[PDB]
Design a binder for these strands. Structure first.
Lengths: 358, 913, 363
DNA sequence: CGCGCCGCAGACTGTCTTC
DNA sequence: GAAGACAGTCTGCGGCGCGA
């Protein structure tokens, strides 16, 4: 119950006036998210794209309009991918097993008057040859499962189930065991040539594709995951007397934070500016925690830094001006030591590589 | 009235005798090789009464006016001249403010130098801004010192508020202050930075140096080097180099004055100046004493050389220049510098872009066939859940066979192997804390940048080395002039100069960017833009040091007048301020003033980043720069000088008729109306006519003609020879400068070699260096130039005296000349701008009448008697309707045009309503 | 003139084949390809780096897609105004403060009643009245410099000053497209008119501490567009007469080019190079470099055409792995800006690319 | 007018470093 | 022992501004 309040206080979530209940956050009726939440969502989307899009060789992204052009807020991105597949077959040089994925905002209805809420979801439509089409979907059933262990503190929370229907012979559904309850965060559906016939009125020549030097109709496997809901579930799994969220460093909005205390004001400001510039140039996100004249307490500042998904806390004191050593504290280890100013960038790079490298 | 123009001459009632022989001579001279019969459209006759003339005639009237204006300052100068003074004190004080010493060096905390004569030299710490750093003054009684207050810890307050040194009491008489260039000390005063007029007037002993015992800069170079071209070499012993030590040596044979060895003020820091405080103050007092002694030796000599009170009254004026400004000055400075940097980096980026495109040539071996950019080295150096099959460990299995040559060797010259040598040299060395990609060490000064973005016609001997420099750049071993090029370059012996024979180097080749057969490659997109970028940034690259850090003092709310307050545009957070130009009066050998930044052309043209400097010189709210450009001041002065010397008529010589009959619009004006028609080009033939008249020679005119456009030596000589036909045809004696005439250079030469009397209008001597009695200059251009220059200076003095008299007898506010290059702006407040325009017109009428009276003839034409248009604007621009480049437009600023006026005297009563 | 064939071949544009200039500029296009999305993401990241994190007292802010006070949002300024109170509260009442946002906004477009989406970047700056003009000048200045960089020919980019109907000065930024000058950004300085319109109940709480005394804040809204900025970058990058050397190249900046590096395999036919290329692929992604899997495609028999297409997508570097990589490792490297052949060891290549990108970003 | 710092540009260069 | 790097070294040609 207090997790939402903590997230809102630390800029992890937006105001709770419109989305006080978890139902609004789960659906698209939530009143936005804080800058920390926006950063976390962007990092999660980038990591998912790198693992699914950039990591994959035959997979290239796609873009679908937020509104439906028609022939009304958009409900899914599969239609755009299916429409663009006609050109992508020739452009990709008969990429029979290739697919198109996109992470974007889609509108869903919530219901006196039923409203429309926008939520961020990642939809991937993959064309596969029929002879192993379902098997290709099974391959995703592994790869998506890998994402379940990509950043989740407890991989056992994620679960998978098999479902069938008239439209799709084989389908996979992924669920996350949130503290409130189990919620479906990923779904899979393997549609055949019926969708191609509906979109293409007898376009067998265009629908047929080159696979293994053979003309084969591509079956479309659509995998839809909840980017916002998935991020919320991962954040909840990260949390576990002290309320500290051990968020994944890769998806953490801020990696390191700069502070000023116990030293010259000009020297501390110069050191903080240099550290921020180095982090920006090196691609390391640095929280601009300096320029604070309050100085309430060290414990309060440490708690605020830990609650803000900060991988580590950096404090600059007279030791930095004396021998270049500043206080470095790791939230996960609950330990503090002295680290060199020059070695801070190397340590951050090593930590990022270790977190990214499984 | 209506005779040949003219008017009902209110001055000099009676007489007005024409002269039968005189008028016949004038008519027969104008008819022959001229056009005396013209439509002569009359102007609407002006029916107004002039202000009463106190004197019997104009000359006596202005003599009395200038005497009334200059008597207190003259008696103050004489009072300090013969005052008895003790020697310097043994030691100086250390308190703030002013101190006096006097009896046995008894320090007393005086708050004000309450006496009407001072020298008051000042020294500043150049490294620590433009703030004052202490000062030594010698009032006639008991010496004086001032403390800058910047020697005390803390108190780092910028914006120049209470930073300058007080020199005037609250007035709850008048003052005079001397100095070498006391314009430099007119700042650091805190009372001269006031919008209201200042009762104190200043005298530069360098102004007197150039007035009496001065040197032309062409002669100053000879003086400092020796400290047809062979001179008599006597004039060096009677003039000095405009330096305080040198002028002290010249004017009195005492122990030599010594420059500071360390030069702590020029090159030093505040603390080091504290360390050498007593020695620096001693040297400053030595400088003040030398200034006082040379002033004592000069003032009687100056007065006997420039005795007419009007010239000294007007020299006291023009040391009271005042350029008001606001926060828009800082905004323009920041915007111009930012645009300069932005365009510099844009041009650098363009250069790297064409470098990349050139490197792309060799992929298809297309650089060899390139008619340009082929002379470089251009050479290439030959240097289900299954994991991966072998993971990334194969990377660790590759490694190297130790061909990396460690880490130092590959980096500086070997980095990026196989690239062309020019690219490799241009690339920053990999062993650098700050590496930048591409050929980022590519500037304008290199030999590669001209090859691309400055191609033009691919100058056939512009292969550099040996003489290098510009070569043919036009048409008329092999490939002396060939479009295909691929020149052998065996030796610079091609058909043509093949070197820099002329060798002209004075900020040139920028005017040739506009057309002039000097262009970039149209094929590229960023090539011509880079040339355009250089064209726009050139002038700011030249003048950003001067234009920035101008010693601008921002007046606070209290220092501004009540005319600014209780105004529609009053208050507001914009910092009002002012700039005293630090204009050195009589900066040239002629009494023309000099200021390298404010008294310059500064056309404010488009396609120039630094332009609009004179623009947005904004009168404060409630004030307008009511000013006029004297309609062809130098040309009219030469014309009337020729008119009175020959037949006493304004239409005697064709120069006089052309000056006033011609008009800019559909008329035969001398500049851009007749010079272009008889000459070539436009707006440059105007400069040619301004140069040939006003002091120059035929070789100078020819050289300027080659500077204007491309022409051969023989063709230029032929053009000059044809030009002398119908021109003055100078250096022809036994005529009574003879020949076709149509331009009287006889008056200038005749008055030049006329011993101590040297100026017609106000009787002012030139110098003891170029005068005829001691020596005879080999080339007489300096003195003939001086005649017109000092006549123009006396014109300006006459306007200043007349305007001061009109502003005193009639309550006209503002009273602040902004005189620049023959134009005068006066900043004359609102609800007086039409009254001030009438005052300007009456002042021009009286000044031209005085010129005529003292120079030979009585009548004055109406075509010249009045200003064509008295510009009443809120900023200083060449025209009321003008625009600038770096901003969107002046209308984006607060400038809203104005009213040129002219014949629009709706406020006919010069007196207040 | 008609360079949209390049966008047709390489998916930098939407799915529709017929893309007139009006169709692209109207903001009602069907969408973009992967390259366009990557380019726009690069633009947003560059803007965030240049504006928010580098300059203090600037924090990103979020706005909902609908305004309950249910219609699609037209401007991002309202969302910043709603969150202004909390954003000023978390800071120590510093009147000079900034807010930033980037998001998709739907607008009504009338063509002869459609709704078109456009990506808007909003910067809302609260300043004292005395510093309003100088801060506005700084904002339009460094925004103009930001536009000039990432542009081969930044003369086409420009700014203009103008006066609003209410008497408030402002500035509008433009790009000179070949068909005509088109707006990209606008700047409006307001005397907290909209802030008081949203919160007219009390004025004391809306004040900020400029020092010992408190004054009413003055707002400045800088609103720019990125999809049109994307098309402007694509048009500027493409370049025609008298060169005697025509090569279709899209010189997109290294900072925002969609694909940075390309991988490939030579003829061989020794095989086994796919594993080396896969390892190099992983080494490239683990540091943040986007790679084109160019080694899957085969039966081309022409490297020149492959390099031409890779240029058309603005791929900064092309890396080719041949049989001489397993021993005496030397991958072939070709640079987009300069078609130069280089031989480089497998190690230090990733760091070379990282240094190249960082140095291009710096200058 | 013009002249000596001044300031980069371009070429030289004796000596350090590597294979 | 032979070749490349390098941090100095000399010359040149724009240019500025002087001199309290």
């Amino acid at each position: 119950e207090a997790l939402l309040e903590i997230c809102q206080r630390r800029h992890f979530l937006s105001g709770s006036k419109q989305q006080l209940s978890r139902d609004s956050l789960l659906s698209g009726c939530h009143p936005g998210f804080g800058p920390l939440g926006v950063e976390l969502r962007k990092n999660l989307a980038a990591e998912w794209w790198t693992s699914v899009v950039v990591f994959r060789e035959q997979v290239f992204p796609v873009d679908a309009l937020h509104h439906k052009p028609g022939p009304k807020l958009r409900e899914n991105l599969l239609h755009g991918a299916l429409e663009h597949y006609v050109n992508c077959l020739d452009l990709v040089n008969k990429r029979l097993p290739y697919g198109l994925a996109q992470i974007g905002v889609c509108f869903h209805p919530v219901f006196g008057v039923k409203s429309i809420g926008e939520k961020t979801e990642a939809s991937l439509v993959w064309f596969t040859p029929p002879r192993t089409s379902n098997q290709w979907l099974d391959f995703w059933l592994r790869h998506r499962l890998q994402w379940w262990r990509k950043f989740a503190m407890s991989p056992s929370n994620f679960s998978s189930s098999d479902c069938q229907d008239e439209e799709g012979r084989k389908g996979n559904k992924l669920y996350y065991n949130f503290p409130w309850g189990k919620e479906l965060i990923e779904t899979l559906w393997n549609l055949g040539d019926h969708e191609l016939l509906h979109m293409y009125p007898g376009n067998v020549s265009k629908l047929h594709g080159r696979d293994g030097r053979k003309n084969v109709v591509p079956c479309v496997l659509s995998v839809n995951g909840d980017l916002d809901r998935g991020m919320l579930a991962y954040l909840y799994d990260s949390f576990q007397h002290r309320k500290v969220l051990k968020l994944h460093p890769c998806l953490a909005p801020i990696k390191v934070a700069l502070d000023v205390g116990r030293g010259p004001t000009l020297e501390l400001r110069q050191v903080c500016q240099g550290l921020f510039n180095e982090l920006l140039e090196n691609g390391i996100s640095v929280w601009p925690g300096y320029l604070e004249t309050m100085q309430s307490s060290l414990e309060q500042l440490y708690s605020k830094y830990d609650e803000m998904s900060i991988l580590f806390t950096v404090l600059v004191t007279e030791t930095t001006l004396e021998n270049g050593l500043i206080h470095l504290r790791s939230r996960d280890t609950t330990m503090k030591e002295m680290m060199h100013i020059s070695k801070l960038k190397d340590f951050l790079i090593k930590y990022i590589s270790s977190a990214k490298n499984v | 009235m209506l005779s040949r123009g003219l008017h009902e001459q209110i001055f000099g009632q009676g007489g007005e005798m024409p002269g039968e022989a005189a008028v016949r001579r004038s008519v027969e001279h104008l008819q022959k090789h001229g056009l005396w019969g013209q439509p002569a459209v009359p102007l609407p006759d002006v029916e107004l009464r002039l202000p009463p003339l106190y004197g019997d005639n104009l000359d006596q009237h202005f003599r009395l006016l200038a005497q009334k204006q200059s008597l207190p300052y003259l008696e103050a100068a004489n009072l300090l001249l013969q005052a008895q003074l003790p020697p310097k004190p043994p030691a100086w004080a250390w308190a703030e403010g002013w101190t006096r010493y006097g009896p046995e060096g008894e320090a007393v905390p005086v708050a004000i130098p309450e006496e009407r004569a001072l020298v008051f030299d000042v020294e500043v710490c150049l490294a620590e801004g433009t703030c004052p750093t202490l000062a030594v003054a010698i009032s006639p009684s008991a010496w004086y010192s001032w403390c800058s207050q910047r020697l005390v810890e803390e108190r780092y307050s910028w914006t120049s508020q209470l930073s300058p040194a007080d020199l005037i009491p609250l007035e709850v008489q008048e003052q005079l202050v001397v100095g070498h260039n006391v314009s430099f000390d007119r700042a650091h005063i805190r009372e001269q930075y006031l919008i209201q007029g200042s009762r104190m007037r200043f005298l530069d002993t360098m102004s007197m140096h150039m007035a009496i015992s001065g040197l032309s800069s062409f002669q100053r170079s000879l003086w400092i080097a020796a400290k047809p071209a062979i001179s008599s070499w006597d004039w060096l012993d009677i003039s000095s180099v405009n330096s305080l030590a040198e002028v002290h040596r010249l004017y009195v044979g005492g122990p030599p004055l010594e420059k500071e060895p360390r030069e702590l003020f020029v090159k030093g820091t505040m603390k080091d100046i504290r360390e050498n405080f007593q020695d620096l103050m001693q040297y400053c007092a030595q400088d003040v004493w030398a200034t006082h002694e040379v002033f004592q030796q000069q003032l009687p000599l100056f007065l006997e050389r420039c005795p007419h009170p009007v010239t000294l009254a007007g020299m006291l004026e023009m040391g009271v220049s005042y350029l008001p400004v606001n926060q828009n000055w800082e905004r323009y400075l920041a915007e111009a510098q930012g645009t300069y940097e932005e365009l510099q980096r844009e041009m650098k980026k363009s250069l790297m872009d064409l470098a990349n495109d050139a490197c792309q040539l060799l992929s298809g071996e297309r650089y060899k066939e390139d008619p340009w950019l082929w002379d470089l080295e251009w050479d290439l150096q030959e240097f289900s859940e299954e994991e991966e099959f072998q993971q990334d460990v194969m990377a660790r299995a590759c490694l190297q066979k130790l061909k990396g040559t460690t880490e130092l060797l590959p980096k500086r010259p070997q980095h990026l192997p196989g690239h062309p040598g020019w690219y490799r040299k241009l690339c920053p060395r990999l062993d650098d804390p700050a590496w930048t990609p591409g050929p980022s060490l590519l500037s304008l000064q290199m030999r590669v940048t001209p090859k691309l973005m400055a191609l033009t016609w691919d100058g056939f001997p512009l292969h550099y080395s040996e003489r290098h420099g510009w070569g043919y750049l036009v048409p008329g071993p092999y490939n002396d002039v060939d479009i295909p090029g691929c020149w052998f370059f065996k030796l610079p012996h091609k058909d043509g100069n093949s070197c820099n024979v002329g060798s002209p180097f004075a900020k040139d080749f920028l005017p040739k960017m506009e057309d002039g057969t000097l262009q970039a490659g149209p094929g590229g997109a960023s090539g011509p833009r880079a040339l355009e970028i250089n064209k726009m940034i050139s002038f700011w690259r030249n003048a950003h040091k001067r234009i920035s850090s101008q010693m601008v003092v921002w007046l606070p709310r209290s220092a501004l007048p009540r005319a600014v307050i209780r105004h529609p545009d009053y208050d507001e957070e914009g910092l009002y301020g002012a700039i005293l130009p630090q204009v050195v009066t009589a900066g040239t050998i002629t009494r023309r003033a000099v200021e390298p930044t404010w008294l310059t052309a500064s056309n404010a043209r488009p396609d120039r980043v630094g332009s609009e400097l004179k623009a947005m010189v904004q009168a404060p709210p409630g004030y307008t720069l009511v000013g006029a450009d004297v309609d062809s001041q130098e040309l009219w002065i030469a014309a009337v000088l020729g008119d009175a010397h020959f037949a006493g008529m304004h239409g005697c010589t064709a120069f006089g008729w052309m000056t006033l009959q011609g008009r800019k619009s559909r008329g035969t004006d001398l500049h851009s109306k007749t010079a272009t028609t008889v000459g070539i080009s436009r707006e440059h033939a105007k400069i040619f006519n301004y140069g040939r008249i006003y002091g120059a020679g035929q070789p100078f005119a020819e050289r300027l003609l080659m500077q204007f456009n491309h022409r051969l030596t023989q063709q230029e000589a032929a053009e000059k020879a044809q030009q002398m036909y119908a021109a003055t045809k100078g250096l022809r004696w036994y005529r009574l400068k003879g020949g076709t005439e149509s331009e009287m250079f006889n008056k200038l030469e005749s008055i030049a070699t006329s011993d101590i009397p040297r100026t017609p209008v106000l009787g002012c001597c030139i110098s003891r260096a170029l005068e005829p009695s001691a020596v005879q200059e080999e080339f007489m251009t300096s003195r003939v130039n001086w005649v017109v220059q000092s006549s123009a200076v006396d014109y300006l003095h006459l306007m200043l005296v007349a305007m001061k008299w009109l502003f005193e007898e009639f309550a006209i506010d503002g009273r602040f000349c902004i005189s620049i290059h023959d134009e005068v702006r006066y900043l004359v407040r609102e609800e007086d701008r039409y009254r001030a325009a009438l005052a300007l017109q009456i002042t021009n009428l009286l000044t031209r009448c005085m010129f005529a009276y003292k120079l030979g003839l009585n009548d004055l034409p109406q075509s010249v008697a009045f200003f064509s248009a008295v510009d009443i604007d809120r900023c200083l621009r060449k025209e009321v309707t003008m625009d600038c480049k770096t901003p969107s437009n002046p209308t984006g600023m607060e400038r809203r045009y104005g009213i040129p006026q002219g014949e629009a005297l709706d406020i006919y009563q010069i007196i207040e309503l």
